Design a protein around this ligand. Structure first.
Ligand SMILES: NS(=O)(=O)OC1CCN(S(=O)(=O)[C@H]2O[C@H](CO)[C@H](O)[C@H](O)[C@H]2O)CC1
Ligand SMILES: [Zn+2]
Length: 258
């Protein structure tokens, strides 16, 4: 039917409605750390989030997302492998039913408990709808989550999740600072890829940070209380909303660090 993460509408089915699922630059991928090549020509990442304006938090039926005002150059990603300025639009997560899975990218086949995606679009294309039609339209900053100590910066997010339990629910979510979700190091891998959900458009420069953030078991367990379903429908926990690693094909993963 309409796509999802279940047995009958999961990642293995997506190619039927979205044939680009089997394309030449699909995401996520396994990051083979010994094969990634250090590229000394990569500029450092510029993450400028000091003026970020969060608007709302939303259960969109496949994850939850915090949305930002992208009508001007407030929160932007620059440098690294990127040319030009990319505006922060939203962030969301992918996570598992258990701590041993949940991430979309993997590192030497290692799966993390979850993965955070900060989604930015290239301002030269004017709006995100136009950007997703371009090979360099989007830049997604991917951050791994492992389970251990709590991430204080994440707690304001986890505390309102019970108010957006089911598909379509949203809440005001102002004055959230996404800087509290970043690890210490901005060391990264980068490769050309795609959206990891339908329409799987091949429009993304992926920037995946080497250093995971630690979140607590209690924080992740609140992720797993969300529902795929709308209210009044049979309750199906929002867990394992991750696409597995896709063939690397004719691509090279570059590292910003030795
Ligand atoms: N998981 S992922 O790799 O981060 O995938 C993306 C990230 C962001 N989108 S999205 O396609 O760019 C984008 O598309 C729309 C316009 O088509 C919307 O208005 C969304 O606001 C927006 O996220 C959906 C999925
Ligand atoms: Zn994502």
């Amino acid at each position: 039917h309409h796509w999802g993460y279940g047995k009958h509408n999961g990642p293995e089915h997506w190619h039927k409605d979205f044939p680009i699922a089997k394309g030449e630059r699909q995401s996520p991928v396994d990051i083979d750390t010994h094969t990634a090549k250090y590229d000394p020509s990569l500029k450092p990442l510029s993450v400028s989030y000091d003026q970020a304006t969060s608007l709302r938090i939303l259960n969109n039926g496949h994850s939850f997302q915090v949305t930002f005002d992208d009508s001007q150059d407030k929160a932007v990603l620059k440098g690294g492998p990127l040319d030009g300025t990319y505006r922060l639009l939203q962030f969301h997560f992918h996570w598992g039913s258990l701590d041993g899975q949940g991430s979309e990218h993997t590192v030497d086949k290692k799966k993390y408990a979850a993965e955070l995606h900060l989604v930015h679009w290239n301002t030269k294309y004017g709006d995100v709808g136009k950007a997703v039609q371009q090979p360099d339209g989007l830049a997604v900053l991917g951050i791994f989550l492992k389970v251990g100590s709590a991430k204080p910066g994440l707690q304001k997010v986890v505390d309102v999740l019970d108010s957006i339990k089911t598909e379509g629910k949203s809440a005001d979510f102002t004055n959230f600072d996404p800087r509290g979700l970043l690890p210490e190091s901005l060391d990264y891998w980068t490769y050309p890829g795609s959206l990891t959900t339908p329409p799987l458009a091949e429009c993304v420069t992926w920037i995946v940070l080497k250093e995971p953030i630690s979140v607590s078991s209690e924080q992740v367990l609140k992720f797993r209380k969300l529902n795929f379903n709308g209210e009044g429908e049979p309750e199906e926990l929002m867990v394992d909303n991750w696409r597995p690693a896709q063939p690397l094909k004719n691509r090279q993963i570059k590292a910003s660090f030795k």
